[PDB]
Amino acid sequence: KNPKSDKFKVKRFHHIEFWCGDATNVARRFSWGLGMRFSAKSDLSTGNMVHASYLLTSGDLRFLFTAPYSPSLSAGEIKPTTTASIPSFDHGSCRSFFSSHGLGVRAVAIEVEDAESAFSISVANGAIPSSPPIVLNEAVTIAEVKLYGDVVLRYVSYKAEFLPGFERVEDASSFPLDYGIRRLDHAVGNVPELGPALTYVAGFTGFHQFAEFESGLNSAVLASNDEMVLLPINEPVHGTKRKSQIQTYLEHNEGAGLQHLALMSEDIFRTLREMRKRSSIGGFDFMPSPPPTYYQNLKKRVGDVLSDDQIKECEELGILVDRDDQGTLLQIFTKPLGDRPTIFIEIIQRVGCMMYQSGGCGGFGKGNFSELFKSIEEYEKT
Amino acid sequence: KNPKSDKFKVKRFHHIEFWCGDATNVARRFSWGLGMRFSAKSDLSTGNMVHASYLLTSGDLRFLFTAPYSPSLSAGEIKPTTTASIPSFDHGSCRSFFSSHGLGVRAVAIEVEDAESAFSISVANGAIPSSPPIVLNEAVTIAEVKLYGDVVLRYVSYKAEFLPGFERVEDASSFPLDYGIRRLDHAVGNVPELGPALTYVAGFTGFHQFAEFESGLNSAVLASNDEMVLLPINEPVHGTKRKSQIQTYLEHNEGAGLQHLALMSEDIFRTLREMRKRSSIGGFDFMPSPPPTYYQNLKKRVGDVLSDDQIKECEELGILVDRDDQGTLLQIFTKPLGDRPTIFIEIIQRVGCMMYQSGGCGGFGKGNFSELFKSIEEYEKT
Ligand SMILES: Cc1c(C(=O)C2=C(O)CCCC2=O)ccc2c1c(=O)n([C@@H](C)c1ccccc1)c(=O)n2C
Ligand SMILES: Cc1c(C(=O)C2=C(O)CCCC2=O)ccc2c1c(=O)n([C@@H](C)c1ccccc1)c(=O)n2C
Ligand SMILES: [Co+2]
Ligand SMILES: [Co+2]
């Protein structure tokens, strides 16, 4: 049941901003590893004396990488005279974020009808303000509230090309890489206590709990009216036969933050082939694959959805499969994206729920905890 | 004339250490962009709770990338009980270095006969100590003195595999990339005042001035006894028809630091082909190429050294050529390696001075300032 209680009009995920020490090297690594092209820039060459920001895109997916310059370059500036293209940026906030958490997501940005109204309504409904609404070139409005830890939810609204002050990247440095990734499906937070986290976010957005049904976690999913913005949140479950990956995250991240970005592919087979070819030459590594017992057990589970050849293609690529009441989910997880065992990426593709495909079709793979556990015990005894 | 005045026995360049915000992403980017393989690691998986350090190698060239973890992981440790594999490492020093300078070289490491003697002798002769000699596993000794700015000269000596506590990297993540780079030829500092810089370094090493003969700089080169360790230093020359790149460096770097690393290739043609193929897919960009007039003028200059086909191969790749009394130098420069217009890399190959090839054969390309200037004026008027 979807009560459609959004307190303001929400469209889709707009972009994800990483706060970096060096945006150039992170962005180039991500570009090669995920097959995203360099689409826009805001840096010294565009007049920005405050921060370096590089935008990668794949389909509708937008990854922004931002790092501060020396404050001495902009020492004479004040906010009214700033050359920053992202007015919410602050050197001290950025350095403190990165020193505290390492490389990770600062901003989960969603496009809304009117960022000013969304901001005012959110704060009126309990949201902690982070950056007030600011109009860029009388054309784009941006505002920010706290989401969890030091992650903000950023609202973006357009009167009618990424952001004013960003320049389109020259087609020469813009190699048209594409491994099939098309959009952000969901963005997941890790928190010490799930209850207060949910109550707070659902409080100021009107987002509703999304339908569901010892793995180290409890989780719940908040969704916008059309369930195209999906914000799962996890908390740890302490004490087991293995340590909670949520607890490990909080320890190495120095508290709550974004755990993983799930990127929808138009062809998860080709995406995973391309990413796996590049793992050891600058790209991303993937978690250890399930044993062959997991893939034998797939026939009994999704044999109606996936042919024997497509199941064997999942096995060759380490792809996991779960299923819902209405849809089927293919998923796989990278190793952590940086030095710390904190943020990682999920690649997914959803099968079913045709109406356009409805959001969350197939769930989030929670049934793969037991299915993975069972297959691992079976392969050991085998 | 080489007076051979080294105050201690110096062997060769050993490694270069970069201080990073995220060592993983910088190291993966450098690996792909330069064709260096992952050879050793010291991180959480090896028991290091203090810093993440990844070693890339190509031939004898060793690039180390190090970033701090959260201090909370090692809060109970003291230096006698440290899990750091590099005992000179300090969280606060590392974060302060990176916040101040951005991504850059912290340590220029040279192998010596006895790091303890080299340290004591250096400090006795004016060197400012940075980290005292420390014996690792009764097998490797390391010590550090200040070189310029926040760059240290690191001494390493071996009784008889990179460093104790580093683990060899699994041949699976160790893809055997190789674009032909073989060793560090020279490492270059930018300082506000050349005179005091030279006097200080030559004072404590015994390194001698290396033979030479408005471009924005003055420079001089310090060399070890066999002239295989080469340390040029630059200072700006203020006021011209263009701003000094040395001054730009000091401004964006917040003072003195390492300007460029020059990497010798066994085949600069293949190195530049491989690096240029990768520039727009995660690798490194190169400075703008000289006009065709520069390459026509090459026949009159090096036509005895390089055939017409090899000169045309230089033109296709943007390679610069200079010549000495005894040798010929092929060189090219990357764009800056990170966000700031500070550190860059030079690729070089030297022709001549056969005895083994003697160090510095062909010089450092100083004649290419005028040759580039002339050809640029000629191409404009053409
Ligand atoms: C993150 C994830 C999800 C996931 O997407 C997700 C949501 O979107 C929202 C609901 C909560 C949630 O979890 C689903 C299945 C996963 C994993 C996952 O992380 N892991 C590995 C990597 C692991 C488990 C334990 C300890 C260390 C690693 C899995 O095995 N499964 C099977
Ligand atoms: C660094 C360099 C060297 C070099 O290696 C070097 C040494 O090893 C020691 C002696 C001093 C020195 O300079 C040689 C030639 C160079 C460059 C160089 O940097 N440039 C570009 C990039 C540039 C010039 C001006 C303003 C901006 C950029 C050149 O054009 N030439 C021709
Ligand atoms: Co997920
Ligand atoms: Co040089």
Curated annotation (Swiss-Prot), chains A, B:
This is 4-hydroxyphenylpyruvate dioxygenase. Residues 12-158, 183-335 form the VOC domain. It is an enzyme of class 1 (oxidoreductase). One of its GO terms (biological process) is tyrosine catabolic process. It holds the Pfam family Glyoxalase. Fe cation binds at residues 186, 260, 346. Its main location: cytoplasm. Its EC number is 1.13.11.27. Gene3D superfamilies: 2,3-Dihydroxybiphenyl 1,2-Dioxygenase, domain 1. It comes from Arabidopsis thaliana. Keywords: Cytoplasm, Dioxygenase, Iron, Metal-binding, Oxidoreductase, Phenylalanine catabolism, Repeat, Tyrosine catabolism. Catalyzes the conversion of 4-hydroxyphenylpyruvic acid to homogentisic acid, one of the steps in tyrosine catabolism. GO terms for molecular function: 4-hydroxyphenylpyruvate dioxygenase activity; identical protein binding; iron ion binding. Homodimer.
